[PDB]
Amino acid sequence: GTFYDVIEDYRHFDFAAYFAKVTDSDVRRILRQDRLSALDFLTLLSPQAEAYLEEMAQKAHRLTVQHFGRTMLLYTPLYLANYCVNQCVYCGFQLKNKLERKKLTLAEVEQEAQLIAATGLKHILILTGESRQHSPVSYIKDCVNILKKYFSSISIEIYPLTQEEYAELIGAGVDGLTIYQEVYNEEVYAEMHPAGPKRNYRFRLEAPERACQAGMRTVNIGALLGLNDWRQEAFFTGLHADYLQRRFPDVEVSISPPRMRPHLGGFPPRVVVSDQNLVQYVLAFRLFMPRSGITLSTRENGRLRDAMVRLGVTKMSAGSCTAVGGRSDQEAVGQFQISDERTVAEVAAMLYAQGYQPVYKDWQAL
Ligand SMILES: C[C@H]1O[C@@H](n2cnc3c(N)ncnc32)[C@H](O)[C@@H]1O
Ligand SMILES: N[C@@H](Cc1ccc(O)cc1)C(=O)O
Ligand code: MET
Ligand code: SF4
Ligand SMILES: [Br-]
Ligand SMILES: [Br-]
Ligand SMILES: [Br-]
Ligand SMILES: [Br-]
Ligand SMILES: [Br-]
Ligand SMILES: [K+]
């Protein structure tokens, strides 16, 4: 009884045959409905629905304001360590790449925490590579103990854990989990993850459930856009979010639509995803799950992020750095290349000028 059962059930679902049946009347009908099914969400991801993106954006904006107000939660990532045993083809930290492997000392964690907290942020997301030798759970726990002096919400985006390990970290102060399945098609997942513990598709797929079972307050998921058939991968992300929300009615479920960016190693995206595709996904997902967060990172350029402020995004990073210690070492190599280099203050000033209140604690979004 896990999401894997749903993946198994859709193994023979014929996406092309479904899209072939969609008509404009279907899209107009869905825009009149209060509740959407998962296949109504698939219809809003169809080529035919590209003719209705304005109507979708009008309603998506209304729904977002209804549930979140004219607010935007700000946060930033903190990469603690970049040791990794996995060979993910698309990642700057994959094992076969040559870079300075680094783990922050606890005093470096504290100093970077102070630097970030000095901008006003209260939500932090901490990341590591998969290395139980260099960045074990006990080290992550020690970092959480320091960070809780500065941040009221600490989320983890680390290697997948057991339920008991999630419970341990929640007991130390972790509030939220972000974990991207990367690709929901099992065959393509095996192709993208040729070596390491991350080759275990099902263990990763079930990680959000294990964390929710352990009591995680918030969970943020997402496919990595660029690895596989984008409409199917967007569909499965939404299907997964809906599954989690139904299995755990009191967890706050969110999605991210991260697009592949340049990175050390140079693997090019297996599939191309346009700006309009990204917008269609965000709009369709907002209409499918009106109360779910949508997180937009600095992978997107500033002009597109500015345009998406009113289109369903509820959480934005700012002042990001994808390299371990890169906030004080401009030559440090990041996991991938960011696009929007604006600081926290610059993103907050942009939001105020759009009539949106930047907020620093998630409970202020209503
Ligand atoms: C932390 C998250 O970053 C994403 N990730 C890994 N490599 C890249 C890349 N080249 N570009 C953009 N995002 C990436 C993965 O989805 C990973 O889970
Ligand atoms: N790549 C991670 C951490 C991150 C968050 C926001 C950024 O702007 C950059 C990196 C994520 O998207 O969850
Ligand atoms: C830094 S990538 C995100 C955390 C972990 N290495 C993963 O791939 O799940
Ligand atoms: S995505 Fe996470 S597991 Fe894969 S190489 Fe990068 S850091 Fe390692
Ligand atoms: Br029609
Ligand atoms: Br490991
Ligand atoms: Br919802
Ligand atoms: Br970089
Ligand atoms: Br900043
Ligand atoms: K030190």
Numbering used by the authors: 2 to 367
Kindly provide excerpts from the paper associated with this entry.
2-iminoacetate synthase ThiH is a radical S-adenosyl-L-methionine (SAM) L-tyrosine lyase and catalyzes the L-tyrosine Cα–Cβ bond break to produce dehydroglycine and p-cresol while the radical SAM L-tryptophan lyase NosL cleaves the L-tryptophan Cα–C bond to produce 3-methylindole-2-carboxylic acid.
Brownish prism-shaped crystals that diffracted to 1.27 Å resolution were obtained. Inspection of the electron density map indicates features that can be best modeled as 5´-dA, L-methionine bound to the radical SAM [Fe4S4]-cluster and L-tyrosine. The phenol ring sits in a narrow hydrophobic pocket while the phenol oxygen atom establishes four polar interactions with the hydroxyl groups of the strictly conserved residues T299, S318 and S321, in addition to the main-chain nitrogen amide of residue T299, hence defining a square pyramidal geometry supporting anion-dipole interactions instead of hydrogen-bonding. We have also performed a 250-ns molecular dynamics (MD) simulation of L-Tyr bound TcThiH at the optimal bacterial growth temperature (60 °C). In addition, as predicted when we solved the L-tryptophan bound NosL structure, this new structure confirms that 5´-dA• attacks the amino group of L-tyrosine in ThiH.
